[PDB]
Amino acid sequence: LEMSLENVAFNVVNKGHFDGQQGEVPVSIINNTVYTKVDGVDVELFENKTTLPVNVAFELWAKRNIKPVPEVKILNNLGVDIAANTVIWDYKRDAPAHISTIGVCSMTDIAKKPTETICAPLTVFFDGRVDGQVDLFRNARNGVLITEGSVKGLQPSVGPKQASLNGVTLIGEAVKTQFNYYKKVDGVVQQLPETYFTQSRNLQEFKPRSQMEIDFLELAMDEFIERYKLEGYAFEAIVYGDFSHSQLGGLHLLIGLAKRFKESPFELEDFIPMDSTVKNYFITDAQTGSSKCVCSVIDLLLDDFVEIIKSQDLSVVSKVVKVTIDYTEISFMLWCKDGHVETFYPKL
Amino acid sequence: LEMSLENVAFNVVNKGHFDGQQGEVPVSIINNTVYTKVDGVDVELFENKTTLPVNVAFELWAKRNIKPVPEVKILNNLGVDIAANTVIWDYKRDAPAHISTIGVCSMTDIAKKPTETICAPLTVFFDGRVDGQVDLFRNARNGVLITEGSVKGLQPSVGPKQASLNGVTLIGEAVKTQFNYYKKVDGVVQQLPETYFTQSRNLQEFKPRSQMEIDFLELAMDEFIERYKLEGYAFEAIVYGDFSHSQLGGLHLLIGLAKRFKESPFELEDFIPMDSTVKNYFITDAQTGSSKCVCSVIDLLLDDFVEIIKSQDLSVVSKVVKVTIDYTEISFMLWCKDGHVETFYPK
Amino acid sequence: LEMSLENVAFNVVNKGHFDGQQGEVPVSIINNTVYTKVDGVDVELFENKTTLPVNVAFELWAKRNIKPVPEVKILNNLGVDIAANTVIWDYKRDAPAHISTIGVCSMTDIAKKPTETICAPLTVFFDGRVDGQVDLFRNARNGVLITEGSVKGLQPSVGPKQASLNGVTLIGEAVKTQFNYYKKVDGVVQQLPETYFTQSRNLQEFKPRSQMEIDFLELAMDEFIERYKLEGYAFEAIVYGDFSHSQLGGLHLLIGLAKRFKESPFELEDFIPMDSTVKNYFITDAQTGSSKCVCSVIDLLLDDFVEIIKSQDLSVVSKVVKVTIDYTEISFMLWCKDGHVETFYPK
Amino acid sequence: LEMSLENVAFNVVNKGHFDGQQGEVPVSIINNTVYTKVDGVDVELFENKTTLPVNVAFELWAKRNIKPVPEVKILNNLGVDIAANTVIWDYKRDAPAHISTIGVCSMTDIAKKPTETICAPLTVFFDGRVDGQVDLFRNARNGVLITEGSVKGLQPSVGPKQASLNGVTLIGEAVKTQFNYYKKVDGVVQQLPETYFTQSRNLQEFKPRSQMEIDFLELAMDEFIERYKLEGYAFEAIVYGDFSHSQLGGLHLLIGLAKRFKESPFELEDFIPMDSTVKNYFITDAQTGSSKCVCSVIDLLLDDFVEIIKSQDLSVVSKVVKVTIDYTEISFMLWCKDGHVETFYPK
Amino acid sequence: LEMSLENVAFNVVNKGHFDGQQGEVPVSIINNTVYTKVDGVDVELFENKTTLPVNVAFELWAKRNIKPVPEVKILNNLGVDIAANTVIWDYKRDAPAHISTIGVCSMTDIAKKPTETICAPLTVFFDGRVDGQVDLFRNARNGVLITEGSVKGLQPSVGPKQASLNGVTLIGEAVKTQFNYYKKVDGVVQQLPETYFTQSRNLQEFKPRSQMEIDFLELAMDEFIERYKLEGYAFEAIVYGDFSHSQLGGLHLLIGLAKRFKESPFELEDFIPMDSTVKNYFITDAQTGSSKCVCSVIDLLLDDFVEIIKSQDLSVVSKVVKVTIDYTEISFMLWCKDGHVETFYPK
RNA sequence: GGUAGUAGGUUGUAUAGUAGUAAGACCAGACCC
RNA sequence: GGGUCUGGUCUUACUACUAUACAACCUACUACC
C-alpha cells in the first residue's frame, strides 16, 4: 503493498520514517502542514518548506535515506541528477536534493527502475550498501557509485572522511563514513581527479582535526606564522581577516571564521541556503562593525591549504588558479605582488 | 478494506463517487484543490469550498448519498443532527449538511455505529432503503426515519412529493421520491403535525404544477383575481409585487418571482447560501430599479396559499400565524387594514 | 457604537448589508472565505476576491453602497481617488473601487472625516442623497459631487442616464438614476465639457434604445446605409465588421457586436476585467475563424455615432481626433483616402 | 531580449498575448492570482488553475499560441510530449497541454532549441506556419509536424476539418484550419493511418453539420430509423437512450444528448474536466429521474457512426473491437445475442 | 534600468543585495516564498513575513539598506514616515519599517523623487552617506537627516552610539555608527532636545558597558546600594525585582533581568514582537514561579538611570514624571511612601 | 564522395555591453592638523 | 596645504556572463552525378 498518504503518516507516528509497515491513521491537511489526530487532538507532523505539493513532499520526506550518505555538495559537483530507488534529503533547505526520483513516489517518478531508456541521459547516484546496485551501475550509461569496500575491475577514488547522517556531518567511527566514488560517463569509466576534500565544519560545533589547526586556534597570529614559516603569503588577511575597514578584508577559510567567533560573536547570514563547495556569506562583525556583502568561505583543512598556497608561483601580477576541490575546479584569484601575496580567494 | 486519500480519488476518476473499489491514483494537493495525474498532466478533481480539511471534505464528498434523499431544509426543521452510516451533501453551499458523521470518515467520526452511548443525545437520520436501518431506529433513543413503504407498529406521515437527487429537486416517476417520515424523541414515537410542503422550485427552470398556476402565469393580474375571487386579499402586492416605489412591495411567493422574471430579468442575491423553508433574497429589479434589502420568499403551491389565505380569518389588524410547513412551525407576519388585507409575509 | 467583525457578520445574516444593528454571531475565517455558524453548520457568507486581508475585504463588502451610484468608469475618469463615508463596490472585479476609505473600516481608514488635512490633496467623491455632504463638498479642496436635484451657486452637468445598482446597470424609473456632476479642483469649481455618454450594454441582454438601432439590427447592411445616407463613411467595416480575412476588420461598436452575435455566436475574452470607456477584447469568431488580438470596442448610441462620424471634416490623410466621451478625451485614429474615409478606429 | 514577469504582464495589458514588445508594468502576486496596477487600482489579469508556480503559469499563459492549433486530444493521441518554441494552452482545464517547454520560460525550459540532445527522446510538435520549423522537423529524431500546404518528400495525412482557436473549436473559412500531419519516430517517417475525427460540439451551442443530423433532430425515432434503414442496430438505445429505468440505458453519442436536452434539460457533471476523445459524464435526467454513474459520451458525425456500426461482423457473443479514432485505438465493448446485436458501447 | 522580479533575484544570488547589475535567473513563487533554480534544484531565497504581496516583499528585501542605519525605534519616535530612495528593513518583525517607498519598487512607489508634491506632507528620512541627499533635505518641507560629519548652517544633534547593521546592534569601530540627526518640520529646522539613549542589549549576549554595571552584576544587592548610596530609592524592587509573591514586583530595567537570568533562567514571552523604547514582557520566573502579566522593561544605562533616580525629587505620594528618552517623552508612574520610594515603573 | 542548397554541437575571430570578495590613480564630500 | 575615512569614475592583470557579426572543426536533412 500500500502506497497512500494515511499509511505514510502511520509510519512517521510509530517509527519516525517510512519503514514499510501496514496501518492507517487520521490525517488532516491544513495550509502546507500535515496534521494527525492523536488522542482526539490534532498534532502537527510536518510543515512543507519545499516547492512540491503537500502530500508529495511528505512522502519523499518519510522515504529519505537515513544511512550515512554523501554530503549534497559532493553530489552536485559530481553532476548527480537523480537518486536510484532512494531520496537524498537536503537538510540545509529542507527539500529533496533532486527534483525527480526513481521508484519512490508515483507522483514524481520518471521510471520504476534506473535501467529504463528515459534515465539513460542522466547521472544516477547508485548506492553500494544495497545489494544489486553495483550491477545496475555497470549497465547504466551515466551514473555515480559509492562503495564502502572495493569493486572489482574499477579504480576507486577515496572520498571525504566525513559524511552526512540525518543532517549531521560527522566522521563515523562505529559506522564507516568513508566511501569510494566511481564515476561513469557515456558508458566509459572516468577516474576522478586528485582533489582536496572539504571538511564541512561549522562555527558552533567547531573542533580542530590536526595539530596545525590547534596551534592556529591557540597561538597568536605572529607566532603561528613564524612557527610554520608562512611569511610572504598574506596569511594575516586571507585567513585571520582584517576587521579594521568599512568592509571585511579576506577571511576566506572557515577555520579563520571559527577563531574570530570565539573572540567576538557575529552572524553569518546565508542568502542561498544550499550545500556547495564554496559558500557565500553576508558576514557582519558585531564588535568592529565590519560587514562584507559577499564573502567566499570555503572550509579546507589547514594542512591542505598551506600546501595549496605554496604550490603556486608568485611572480605573475595576478593569475587564476584552478584547484580540484570536492571533484570540481574552484577558481582561486591569486592576486600577488613582488612574491608576497596580496589576496587569495575562491570564486563561486 | 482500504480507507485512504489515493483510493478515494481512484473511485472519483472511474465512477464519479466512492463505490468501494480497490485501486490507487496519483494525487497532488495544492491550495484547497485536489488534483490528479491523468496522462501525465494534472487534472483538477475537487475544489474545497468547505470549512473542513482538504482531504476530509474530499472523503465526505465522495461518500455522499446519491439516492433520492430528503431536502436539507426538511432535515434541519426535523432537528436532524447527524446521518447514520451516510453523508447527506448540501449542494446549496457545497458542504456536508451535518458537521459530524457516523462510520464514514475516521477524521470526523464520533462513533462507528449509531447505537453507541455518545450518539444517544442526538437525533440521527435513519434511511429506509438500507437493510437493518429500521431495526436501529426502534432501538435508538432519538432518531428520524424515512421509508418508501410502511413500517409495522408506527403511524407514517406523508412527506413532500419532491426530493433532492444529486442537487436536483424533482418529483420522481421512475424512482419513488415520496417518503414516510417517523420521528422518535426520548424513546417515545411522536406523530408529525399535518403540514403543507414547499415545492422548492427555481426561477430559471420554473414549471407550473397546477391549473391555477398556469392561469397565474398566463392571465393578467385583474383577470386572475376575478376568476378565483381573490378580491380583498392584497393579491396584487403580496404575490405580484409592487415595482413602483424606491423599495419593493410584497412579492413573497416564488411563483410571483417567476412571473416577473419572464417579463423583466433581475438578480436574486442570496446572502445566506443555505437551504431553508423561508429564504431571504436581496432582490434588485433591473427594469424599474426597485430593490429590497430583505425579501422573505417562500415557495408554496398556489392552491395551498389560496387555501391558507382563505383560512386566514382576516378580522384583526395584526396577528402572527403559526403554519406547519415542512414539519415545523412558520410564523407569518399578517397586517390587515379595515376592509381587506394589507400585507402577509413570513418572518 | 461597536465596530467588530462578529457584529458586521450579524447584519449580513439578518439584513444583507451593514445597517448598524447591535448583535454578534459566530464567525470562522478559513482561507479567504468568511463562514458563519447557523443551526450548527458553517454557512459561507463571503469569498474574498480582493487583494486586501480576509476580514478587511468582508467589512468593506458589507458596508458597500446599495443606492444607485455612478458607474466605476465615470469615477475613474473624473479622477476620484476615495469615497467619503462610503465604499463604492466594483462588481466587475469584486473589489472596492478605491484602495482607501474614509470612516469605514479602521484597518484602511486614512481619516474619520473628509475635512482632515490628509484628505486635502485627494479628489473625494461626495454623495448628494446624504444630508450634510453638500456642505462638505464646498469646504473640500478637491472633490466630486453628484446630486439628483440642483445645488445653488453651482452649474450642474447632466450625467449619464444609466447608473449602477448592485452591479446591474439600468435606466431607473422608480428611482432617479440621472445625477448632476460637480467637479472642484484646487478650491476652484470647474465645469465639465459636453460629452457623449456610453450606454454600457452587453451582447446577451442587448436591447435597442432608438429607432435607428432597431433598423440596424433588422435591416440589411446595404438597406440601412441607404436609408440613413451613410455612403462614404466605411460603415460596412467600422460597425458591421469584416469577417473575411485572417484578422478581424473594424467592428469597433458594441451594437455591431450584438448584430453579429445573433447571427453567429462568438467569445469575447476580456484580458483586463475592469470598467472603462474603451474596452479591449480578444474577439474570436466561431464561424469564419477570424480573430483579432486587440479590438477597441466602445459602446456608443448609434444616433450619437452618426453625428460624430458626420462631424469629422475628412480633408487630411491621417489625423488624431480628440473627442470628449464620458468626461474624458479619447483619441480616435482616423485614416482617410483621397475621396472617402478609409478607417476610423479609437486607439 | 528581456524575459521577465513584469515584461510579460505588459504585453497582456496592451496586446492580450505575449507578442514580444518591450515594457514593464507593476505586478502584484496574491494567492494564485496575478494582479496589475492600472490607474492606481489593482486589476486581476490571471488566476492560476494549474499546479505550476504563480508567475510561471502567467508567463506561459501570455505566451500561448493564438493561431489555429490542433485540438489537444489530437496531440495527446499522436504522442506529442512538448511543443517547440511555443506553448499550446489547453482551455478545457486552463493549464498548458505540456508540462515542459522549449525556449519559452527559463523556469521550465529544458532546452533553448529543439535540436539539443535532451530533446531527442521526445516527440516534439513542430508548427508549419513558422519559417524554419520544417527544416527542424527533418533533423529531429522524434517529432510531429503540421502544415497547411504540402512538404516535399513526405506523404501528408489530412487532419480534422476543425481546429482549436483561443479555446473555440471551429471549421475555419477565412483562415485554413485543415492541416497535414506528419509523424517521425526514431528518425523514420511513419505514415498516419486513416481515421475518423470527432466534431467536438456541445449541448448548448449545438448545430447539425449534415442532412442526416437534421433529420435526427427533427423526425421521430421510428421515422428516422425507417428512412435510413437502421433496423436491427439498437439505435433506439445506443443514441436516443432509454429514460425508463433506474439507470440510463445507452445514450453514448453527443448528438443523442442534444436531442434529449432540447426536449428536457438535464445536467452533465464532468468529474474529469479535461479534453479527451471519449468523455465520461455523470448524467442526471431532470424529468424521469434517470441517472447513470459513468456514461461514455463520444461526439462522432452521425454519417460516420452509421458506417462504423455496420462494420462489426456480429458473429461472437462478446468481442473487444479496436477502432482507429483520432489517430488512436479505441476499445469498443461489443455484446451480441444470438440473432442480433445486444449492446455496443466504448470502454 | 531594468526593474523586474527576475533581475532582482539575480543580484541576491550573486551579491546578496540589489546592487544594480544586469542579469536574469529563474524564479518560482510558491506560497509566500520566492524560490530560484540553481543547478536544477529549487533553492529558497526569501520567505515573506510581511503583509505585502510575495514578489513585492522580496523586491523590498533585496533592496534593503546594508549600511549602518539608525535603529527603527529612533526613526519611529522622530516621526519618520518614508525613506528616500532606500528601504530600511526592520529585522525584529522581518518587514519593511515603512509601508511606502520612494523610487524603489514600482508596485509600492508613491513617487520617484522625494521632491514631488505628494511627498511634501510626509517626514522623509534622508541619508548623509549618499551624495545629493543633503541638498534634497534642505529643499524638502518635512524630513529627517543623518550625517556622519557636519552640515554647514545646521546645528547637529549627537545620536546614539550604537546603530543597526543587518539586524545586529553594535557600537561601530571600523565604521562610524554615531550619526548627527537633523529634523525639519514645515520648512523650519527644529533642534532636538537632549535625551538619554537606550543601549538595546539582550539577556543572552549581555555585556556590561560601565564600571557601575560590573559592580551590579558581581556585588550583592546590599553591597551595591551601600557603595553608590542608593538608600531610599527602592532599588531593591525597581531593578533587582521581588520574586516572593504571586506576581512579580518591579524589575523594570533590562540590566536587572540579566542578573536574574544568570542566577535562574526564565522565559520572556514578548506578545508584541516589534522594536520600541519601552518593551512589555510576559515574564515567568522558572524557580519561584512568579509571573507578571505586563512588565515594562526599558534598557537604560545604569549610570543614566541613577542620575534620573537621584533627580526624582521624592516629595509627593504619587507623581507622573516626563523623561525625554530616545527623543520622546516617557511617562514614569512614581509611587512614594512617606520616608522612601515605594515603586517607580514606566507606564 | 562531390556540387547546388538549408542546419545543430565544439572552437576561434571581430565589434560591443556588464561583472569579479585585491591594489593603484582621479574627482567629490566629511573629519583632524 | 597635509593625513585619515566614505560616494562616483578610471587603471593594473586574469577570467566569467549577455548582444551582434564572421570563420573553422565534428557532423544532420533534401535536389543531381
mmCIF file with all atom_site columns, C-alpha atoms (C1' of nucleotides) in Angstrom, chain A residues 252 292 296 342, chain F residues 20-23:
data_model
loop_
_atom_site.group_PDB
_atom_site.id
_atom_site.type_symbol
_atom_site.label_atom_id
_atom_site.label_alt_id
_atom_site.label_comp_id
_atom_site.label_asym_id
_atom_site.label_entity_id
_atom_site.label_seq_id
_atom_site.pdbx_PDB_ins_code
_atom_site.Cartn_x
_atom_site.Cartn_y
_atom_site.Cartn_z
_atom_site.occupancy
_atom_site.B_iso_or_equiv
_atom_site.pdbx_formal_charge
_atom_site.auth_seq_id
_atom_site.auth_comp_id
_atom_site.auth_asym_id
_atom_site.auth_atom_id
_atom_site.pdbx_PDB_model_num
ATOM 1 C CA    . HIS A 1 252 ? 38.016 33.111 3.219   1.00 0.00 ? 252 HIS A CA    1
ATOM 2 C CA    . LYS A 1 292 ? 31.125 42.366 3.673   1.00 0.00 ? 292 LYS A CA    1
ATOM 3 C CA    . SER A 1 296 ? 33.526 33.357 -0.306  1.00 0.00 ? 296 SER A CA    1
ATOM 4 C CA    . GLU A 1 342 ? 48.085 40.301 -1.617  1.00 0.00 ? 342 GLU A CA    1
ATOM 5 C "C1'" . G   F 2 20  ? 34.651 39.915 -10.407 1.00 0.00 ? 20  G   F "C1'" 1
ATOM 6 C "C1'" . U   F 2 21  ? 35.479 39.323 -2.451  1.00 0.00 ? 21  U   F "C1'" 1
ATOM 7 C "C1'" . A   F 2 22  ? 42.676 42.678 -4.221  1.00 0.00 ? 22  A   F "C1'" 1
ATOM 8 C "C1'" . A   F 2 23  ? 45.792 47.011 -5.417  1.00 0.00 ? 23  A   F "C1'" 1
#
